[PDB]
């Protein structure tokens, strides 16, 4: 059967991995909303948008107004480092605007575009559960997502619409590599040395590949998971168990 999916931040990392998996069935149409397009497929639609700008999101909503969605994956997001004292107001706002508001604007705007029985999945973080040093804005944003998950699950349950959030540990993405490279350069160690330090933070002693997180997202979007809603689902190599 034909199905439609929407992915915000679908051009890189987990979002890209989810897009590629969803495209495997030719009866699936995926709509990727991001600032730059990634790869192409006949069943992949790209719409450019700066997800920190409400007006850009309003423009997307107009374009997709007739589409009814089976699944949505919200992977827009950024991490800017710093404790509350070290990150400026402008950056905190940027993190909230992308990580939280972009999803608010979309879900609010897709009220009549969500099929009965649809599945909405947020990209959360192990920081939906715990904090990490010098990560104020990001942790704050993931707390908001954690509870937004539960509110939407309660209010959308009458329509059999499920809402869940994957909570990844560190994932080998562009943004991750960027932060760790800049950290490595700052403290005078190699990238490899830096990654090894990060890997030891997890009981599994490794970080995740984006495809691994995407498999869980795909499960949550699939017809196999219809009784799951309102859940924060750990995929963190044991991080929150310790």
Q: What CATH number is given to the structural domain containing 59?
A: 3.40.50.720
**Opening angle at CA 176, ends 203 and 123, nearest 5:** 80
Neighbours of 200 (CB within 10 A): 10
Q: What's this structure's resolution in Å?
A: 1.8
**Token duo for residue 128:** 């939906």
Instruction: Give the CA count within 13 Å in the CB-facing half-sphere of 170.
Output: 21
**Token duo for residue 37:** 């397009």
> What's the CA gap between 37 and 31, in Å, rounded?
11
Mode of pairing for the β-strands spanning 162-168 and 114-123 = parallel
Instruction: Give the CA count within 13 Å in the CB-facing half-sphere of 157.
Output: 12
Q: Are 100 and 148 in contact (CB under 8 A)?
A: yes
Neighbours of 65 (CB within 10 A): 11
Would you please indicate which residues are annotated as catalytic (active-site) residues? 138
Which pairs count as long-range contacts for 213-218, CB under 8 Å and 24+ apart, including other chains?
Answer: 213/14, 213/17, 213/123, 213/166, 213/168, 213/171, 214/14, 214/17, 214/18, 214/20, 214/21, 215/21, 216/166, 217/14, 217/18, 217/73, 217/121, 217/123, 217/166, 218/18, 218/21, 218/22
Residues 6+ away with beta carbon under 8 Å from 29? 2, 3, 4, 5, 43, 44, 45
Q: Are 30 and 22 in contact (CB under 8 A)?
A: yes
**Token duo for residue 183:** 């950290």
> What's the CA gap between 221 and 239, in Å, rounded?
24
> What's the CA gap between 136 and 142, in Å, rounded?
10
> What's the CA gap between 136 and 49, in Å, rounded?
26
Residue 13, domain extent: 1-242
Instruction: Please give the order of strands across the beta sheet that includes 69-74.
Output: 44-48, 28-34, 3-8, 69-74, 114-123, 162-168, 232-235
> What's the CA gap between 89 and 97, in Å, rounded?
12
**Experimental technique for the deposited model:** X-ray
Strand residue runs (E) in 41-161: 44-48, 69-74, 114-123
Domain tally, the chain = 1
């Amino acid at each position: 059967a034909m199905a439609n999916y929407l992915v915000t931040g679908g051009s890189k990392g987990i979002g890209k991995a989810v897009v590629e998996l969803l495209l495997q069935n030719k009866n699936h149409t995926v709509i990727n909303i991001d600032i730059q397009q990634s790869f192409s497929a006949e069943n992949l639609k790209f719409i450019k948008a700066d997800l920190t700008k409400q007006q850009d999101i309003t423009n997307v909503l107009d374009i997709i107004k007739n589409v009814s969605f089976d699944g949505i994956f919200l992977n827009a997001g950024i991490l800017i480092k710093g404790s509350i004292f070290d990150i400026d107001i402008e950056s905190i706002k940027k993190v909230l605007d992308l990580n939280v508001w972009s999803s608010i604007y979309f879900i609010k705007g897709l009220e009549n575009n969500l099929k009965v029985g649809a599945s909405i999945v947020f990209n959360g973080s192990d920081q939906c559960f715990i904090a990490k040093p010098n990560s104020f804005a990001y942790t704050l944003s993931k707390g908001a997502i954690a509870q937004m998950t539960k509110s939407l699950a309660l209010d959308l349950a009458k329509y059999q619409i499920r809402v869940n959030t994957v909570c990844p540990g560190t994932v080998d993405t562009d943004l991750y590599r960027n932060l760790i490279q800049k950290y490595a350069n700052n403290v005078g160690i190699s990238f490899d040395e830096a990654q090894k330090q990060e890997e030891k933070e997890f009981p599994l002693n490794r970080i995740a590949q984006p495809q691994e997180i995407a498999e869980l997202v795909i499960f949550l979007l699939s017809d196999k998971s219809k009784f799951m809603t309102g859940g924060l689902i750990p995929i963190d190599g044991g991080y929150t168990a310790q």
